[PDB]
Ligand SMILES: Nc1ncnc2c1ncn2[C@@H]1O[C@H](COP(=O)(O)OP(=O)(O)O)[C@@H](O)[C@H]1O
Ligand SMILES: Nc1ncnc2c1ncn2[C@@H]1O[C@H](COP(=O)(O)OP(=O)(O)O)[C@@H](O)[C@H]1O
């Protein structure tokens with residue numbers, strides 16, 4: 001079978017996705033945004049695809065033929081309306097007789113779904129995909145679906161916000177409806193400065209770049225802050241009061257695969273994911289039910305899912321959001337390391353063969369150990385005191401992890417720091433701003449989580465200010 | 466305009482061809498032999514093409530997704546008949562609305578021509594391309610064309626050869642009709658051992674790999690050895706008694722661009738090319754006339770040409786051979802360095818626009834200096850005595866060029882040796898076996914050629930035997 005991949009940022013990382021897919025399928029890659037593609041990404045696409053097609057228009061000169069090493073968020077304009085994007089996708093599919101279409105990138109989910117339906121291929125579902133991508137429609141579907149419901153309001157203007165603040169009460173979450181990576185997500189707790197904080201993130205939001213193909217009924221959503229209750233859920237310290245759960249939708253039914261525990265965020269910036277969760281079978285069961293309800297509630301037909309859930313009092317799961325694509329970072333690879341299951345090949349099996357694919361019957365179990373995928377950020381070294389506070393940028397010489405920080409049988413499997421000499425802007429959003437990454441392994445989750453904490457605390461940065 | 470490139474080995478090197486082409490045209494690359502493609506080659510194709518299509522069939526497992534650093538001659542089978550190859554090429558062209566098709570590789574010239582004619586695009590010409598690729602048909606066309614004619618005979622069997630030897634006389638050239646790089650080309654001078662030497666190269670020839678799409682009326686051609694007379698041509702030492710001339714055919718007319726001088730071969734293995742020739746305007750005129758006659762004699766319509774000519778007594782040009790593609794090594798790039806003319810863009814202009822392209826009116830002149838592209842081989846170090854003779858392979862540690870070897874204002878512009886640790890088989894044909902390369906520049910051709918000699922003589926190899 002021939003699988004068209006719409007190749008862009010995020011989701012199951014290029015280092016796993018292309019090889020896993022090409023092992024069983026003939027991959028054709030469409031690159032709608034050549035400028036979104038790193039050098040390493042471009043070499044993987046070419047290595048594992050039998051054809052590659054790029055959007056011609058985003059080539060003006062030779063300088064446009066260069067690949068950067070790192071892209072944190074795509075900088076350049078993409079001003080084609082959705083229906084045109086659908087048309088490009090359909091055209092590529094028909095050029096290569098694609099039996100399936102898939103993507104790892106948020107921004108192309110909606111149009112891909114329309115293409116699949118036009119082509120009679122399996123997909124997220126047209127309306128379902130819109131639900132999965134506009135947070136107001138998403139939250140509305142969740143409320144209808146009988147999971148924990150919370151007050152939410154569309155916000156466009158200062159007046160909209162002020163209303164919302166009255167109706168919802170603090171604590172209040174205000175976030176854009178159409179981005180990711182916690183971009184813009186703000187916690188309103190003080191009715192005094194609440195309008196001020198609306199104005200600042202309002203302005204910030206029109207300086208970020210998204211394709212014109214990204215539709216939304218309002219710029220912001222305000223909603224009840226879902227309060228954690230860590231102790232109603234976890235028996236030991238080390239984790240946080242949210243998780244993610246990775247699943248597959250197949251012919252409209254939800255198949256859970258694995259729940260990931262997390263380390264505490266910095267602000268709303270994520271720090272680490274641990275495959276798989278230490279939570280007890282009853283907690284996992286409650287999480288699974290909420291994610292089933294939410295995703296089936298969205299209407300999703302065939303796709304991967306990444307669903308984020310707040311661990312609230314009385315063991316109530318609160319739906320934070322759900323995406324119709326794979327978890328980012330190394331969560332999908334780490335599922336394969338732990339359990340041997342290749343969720344990328346499993347999605348493609350489902351797209352090409354439906355419930356004929358070999359879907360597990362429940363969350364995977366019998367993990368031989370735990371694996372943590374962890375990032376460090378400048379803000380860790382501001383909190384460390386390694387970076388002075390009065391510092392709007394720096395230039396990075398080295399990042400070192402002192403010995404003696406690991407608990408129990410935990411190990412450092414890998415570690416990679418921003419290359420010596422790397423320039424760092426210290427004004428920009430942490431999430432774009434990771435400067436080091438590491439993988440731990442160990443038989444004891446609590447020890448793994450403690451080792452992550454120690455490493456965050458004691459890592460040594462050498463830079464010049 | 467959209468240009469389909471059939472991407473394989475040889476001709477204008479990937480480091481120039483893809484960028485030059487993509488500067489003016491949208492390139493679609495067809496890779497009929499993924500295993501012919503080095504890592505550096507694959508990255509260039511992907512960097513500069515708006516689409517890439519590979520032949521699916523030459524992917525069995527993940528191991529087939531690897532790119533080697535170096536390919537001297539494509540190892541794997543390609544057993545599709547010509548008409549099928551034509552069909553693939555036509556299919557790709559029609560998929561992308563190609564306005565032109567081109568290739569740098571000998572082995573795809575014939576089929577490309579048939580595709581172009583089927584598509585109503587400019588090309589070599591169906592019959593012309595067959596002439597340019599079967600050396601018996603080629604030599605026949607040359608003889609008809611009124612250049613120096615020589616006796617030639619088809620050879621398939623020991624009996625065919627023995628006849629030929631009687632009819633032609635020594636000195637005699639026996640060579641395969643369908644390969645390149647001097648593979649199999651043998652000099653018969655002694656009627657005693659002549660049959661023996663036929664049997665050995667007969668056997669050797671069935672152990673080399675070519676696609677089944679390569680048609681020929683006989684395996685070998687025997688022909689008169691064209692005798693040099695260096696002194697009838699050159700006024701100084703340093704060169705050899707053959708040259709090449711690089712041209713463009715446009716609507717059936719020959720356009721010379723540049724003549725390259727050469728350093729003496731090792732056996733029949735080429736050593737260096739110097740852009741442009743030092744030969745006087747009358748010698749150049751004679752060379753141009755022979756190359757016009759030969760190429761126009763073949764019937765070539767639209768293509769690049771690389772024509773090799775023996776410098777024979779009384780200033781008679783002897784046609785050695787002519788290919789309907791670009792010279793290999795760095796001859797095309799070095800034309801651009803010397804004269805500023807980009808012959809790759811000039812070919813594509815001609816394919817898309819005919820004699821509307823900006824063809825020069827005569828050989829390029831006013832060179833600001835000379836540029837030599839030079840290779841060293843193991844056999845240089847056997848002749849140096851650096852490698853013992855009783856040595857069937859070695860492993861290369863380093864290659865060093867002593868100071869004080871350069872004449873006049875000559876310079877070493879670049880130098881690259883086989884990477885320290887490289888394994889070298891010393892049984893295999895020199896031409897596949899280059900272990901070092903360098904570029905010289907200088908205002909004095911005779912000094913440049915002398916500096917090449919010194920470097921060949923005195924280079925130092927460190928290896929283990
Ligand atoms: N309603 C909410 N209640 C509690 N926390 C939230 C809420 N919305 C967002 N967050 C926090 O902010 C993070 C980012 O918000 P999310 O809805 O996941 O948007 P994004 O698509 O930017 O990641 C979440 O992981 C969660 O920690
Ligand atoms: N008829 C000939 N007379 C003299 N030299 C020849 C003849 N044929 C081949 N050679 C020599 O052998 C080399 C390789 O032969 P050529 O016909 O160019 O085949 P290939 O396509 O392998 O390069 C030529 O460059 C030339 O030096």
Ligand SMILES: [Mg+2]
Nearest residue numbers: 179180181321
């Ligand atoms: Mg999100």
Ligand SMILES: [Mg+2]
Nearest residue numbers: 181182308321
């Ligand atoms: Mg999120």
Ligand SMILES: [Mg+2]
Nearest residue numbers: 644645646786
């Ligand atoms: Mg040849």
Ligand SMILES: [Mg+2]
Nearest residue numbers: 646647773786
């Ligand atoms: Mg030749």
